[PDB]
Design an enzyme around this catalytic site. Structure first.
Site, short mmCIF file in Angstrom:
data_model
loop_
_atom_site.label_atom_id
_atom_site.label_comp_id
_atom_site.label_asym_id
_atom_site.label_seq_id
_atom_site.Cartn_x
_atom_site.Cartn_y
_atom_site.Cartn_z
N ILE A 180 -80.59 29.35 -48.14
CA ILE A 180 -79.70 30.50 -48.24
C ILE A 180 -78.42 30.05 -48.93
O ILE A 180 -77.77 29.09 -48.51
CB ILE A 180 -79.40 31.08 -46.85
N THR A 238 -80.92 32.60 -35.41
CA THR A 238 -80.95 31.73 -36.57
C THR A 238 -79.53 31.55 -37.09
O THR A 238 -78.72 32.49 -37.03
CB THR A 238 -81.85 32.30 -37.69
N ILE A 292 -89.12 39.96 -44.27
CA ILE A 292 -88.73 38.76 -45.00
C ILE A 292 -89.67 37.58 -44.75
O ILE A 292 -89.64 36.61 -45.52
CB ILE A 292 -87.29 38.35 -44.66
N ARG A 297 -99.72 34.16 -36.89
CA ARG A 297 -99.94 33.09 -35.93
C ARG A 297 -98.97 33.35 -34.78
O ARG A 297 -98.07 34.18 -34.89
CB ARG A 297 -99.71 31.70 -36.52
N1 LIG Z 1 -83.84 37.87 -47.68
C1 LIG Z 1 -83.14 37.53 -46.57
N2 LIG Z 1 -82.05 38.23 -46.18
C2 LIG Z 1 -81.34 37.90 -45.09
N3 LIG Z 1 -81.65 36.87 -44.29
C3 LIG Z 1 -82.72 36.08 -44.55
C4 LIG Z 1 -83.54 36.38 -45.73
N4 LIG Z 1 -84.52 35.45 -45.77
C5 LIG Z 1 -84.34 34.64 -44.70
N5 LIG Z 1 -83.26 35.01 -43.97
C6 LIG Z 1 -82.77 34.34 -42.75
O1 LIG Z 1 -83.38 33.04 -42.70
C7 LIG Z 1 -84.20 32.93 -41.54
C8 LIG Z 1 -85.45 32.11 -41.83
O2 LIG Z 1 -86.10 32.55 -43.02
P1 LIG Z 1 -87.67 32.88 -42.95
O3 LIG Z 1 -88.05 33.53 -44.26
O4 LIG Z 1 -87.91 33.58 -41.64
O5 LIG Z 1 -88.31 31.39 -42.91
P2 LIG Z 1 -89.14 30.70 -41.70
O6 LIG Z 1 -90.54 30.63 -42.24
O7 LIG Z 1 -88.49 29.34 -41.56
O8 LIG Z 1 -89.00 31.54 -40.45
C9 LIG Z 1 -84.50 34.36 -41.10
O9 LIG Z 1 -84.74 34.44 -39.70
C10 LIG Z 1 -83.23 35.08 -41.52
O10 LIG Z 1 -82.21 34.90 -40.53
NA NA Z 2 -79.25 34.74 -37.87
NA NA Z 3 -94.16 32.76 -41.92
NA NA Z 4 -91.69 31.80 -40.04
#
Ligand SMILES: Nc1ncnc2c1ncn2[C@@H]1O[C@H](COP(=O)(O)OP(=O)(O)O)[C@@H](O)[C@H]1O
Ligand code: NA
Ligand code: NA
Ligand code: NA
Ligand SMILES: [Mg+2]
Length: 387
Positions: A180, A238, A292, A297
């Protein structure tokens, strides 16, 4: 009162460990990976689980005995990489088991024919690049998947904040493979990390960072007899960079959030999916839903939702903690707080398995009480006693 053995056949054996062979987008500590092997122990029921020896010591039995539970007799233990990989092979070949992996392992550890769920389908469902294929093309942030050779020229077209994610077939979870970026200094760090992972990265997802007002993990289960069943939802804890710390319970999930997740679950089920799934659904200020991350699983919030019948419904906080150095004080402070009634133990990695304070002990739990303020005061007092 659903349990995992209700969803998987009698010949399935479960491992929630990342492979000892890591990838740059899933590189947790070796002890964090071992600590994960016992996370789903209380909801496994009849499903056998592959667990590190240090994750099922007498320390765990003591914590379970307080809440009136036992450590399941159907666990297989390992203590290093060689015994872990040999156990998986022996289970599939000699015991004629099928192995359910939370995260795929390479084919030389176990051929895909011995996977409990079709490996190709599992990889496709859990592929972040392919999310729009499972959401009927809806709920995604503004995004583009680019090859790594075009990433430099493409990233210049995007405003902050944004997210960069690997767009290939590698397993990832817990925030270990998400970058991020809120400004150029973040991007500079991400570019270096991507460059050091050139060997394992062929494409990148570029995604707008949603200014979310809520962050749900909406969970469902499917079996041929049960149908598609909504399990509930949890809020994600998170940090600013997406690193996963835990979950809070929810009280009033919007209807359209649940329906977005159910439609995704139906699309996966119609392709052959079964078991537990959890979808990360953000909600912005205008109540739009964003898918997102699809987790076809189990995950951490699954234990919170499947054990809801044993927890105070006012406020729940699923979380993990590390020993400050003194494993004995760590365990005795934990055991003390479990007996006080508002701390539900889930998993314990006994660092003293490696000797006196040679490795940090780890504890996964759910704080649960009537009010959030009272629960957080209880956690804050537990952390103060640990210094
Ligand atoms: N497009 C997005 N906009 C806002 N927050 C995001 C976005 N993508 C990821 N995040 C933040 O990052 C965290 C982890 O990303 P994620 O895609 O869930 O990966 P993981 O596979 O590690 O769970 C999410 O829980 C969210 O808080
Ligand atoms: Na968060
Ligand atoms: Na996933
Ligand atoms: Na995940
Ligand atoms: Mg996620």
């Amino acid at each position: 009162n659903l349990t995992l053995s209700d969803l998987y056949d009698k010949d399935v054996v479960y491992t929630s460990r990342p492979s000892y062979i890591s990838n740059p987008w899933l590189k947790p500590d070796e002890h964090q990976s071992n600590f994960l092997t016992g996370r789903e122990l209380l909801i496994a029921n009849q499903l056998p689980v592959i667990v590190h020896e240090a994750s099922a010591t007498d320390k765990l039995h003591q914590l379970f005995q307080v809440i009136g539970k036992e450590v399941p007799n159907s666990i297989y233990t390992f203590n290093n990489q060689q015994s872990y990989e040999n156990l998986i092979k022996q289970l599939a070949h000699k015991e004629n088991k099928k192995i359910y992996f939370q995260y795929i392992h390479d084919e030389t550890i176990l051929n895909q024919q011995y996977y409990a769920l079709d490996k190709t389908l599992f990889v496709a469902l859990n592929n972040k690049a392919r999310i729009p294929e499972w959401t009927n093309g809806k709920f995604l942030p503004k995004r583009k998947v680019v090859k790594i050779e075009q990433f430099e020229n493409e990233i210049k077209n995007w405003e902050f904040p944004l997210v960069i994610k690997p767009g290939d077939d590698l397993p990832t979870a817990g925030g270990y493979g998400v970058m991020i970026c809120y400004h150029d200094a973040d991007l500079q760090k991400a570019i270096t990390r991507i460059k050091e992972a050139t060997a394992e990265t062929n494409s990148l997802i570029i995604e707008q960072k949603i200014e979310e007002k809520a962050n749900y993990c909406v969970q469902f289960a499917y079996s041929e007899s049960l149908g598609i069943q909504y399990l509930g939802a949890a809020t994600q804890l998170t940090d600013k960079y997406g690193f996963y710390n835990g979950n809070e319970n929810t009280t009033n999930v919007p209807e359209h959030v649940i329906e977005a997740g159910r439609q995704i679950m139906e699309n996966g089920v119609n392709q052959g999916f079964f078991g537990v799934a959890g979808f990360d659904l953000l909600v912005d200020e205008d109540d739009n839903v964003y898918a997102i991350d699809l987790n076809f699983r189990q995950n951490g919030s699954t234990s919170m939702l499947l054990l809801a019948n044993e927890l105070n419904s006012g406020y729940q906080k699923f979380y993990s903690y590390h020993s400050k150095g003194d494993n004995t004080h760590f365990f005795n402070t934990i055991l003390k707080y479990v007996k006080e009634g508002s701390l539900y133990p889930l998993s314990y990695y006994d660092g003293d398995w490696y000797g006196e304070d040679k490795v940090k002990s780890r504890f996964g739990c759910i704080w649960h009480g009537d009010s959030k303020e009272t629960v957080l005061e209880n956690e804050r007092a537990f952390l103060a006693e640990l210094e």
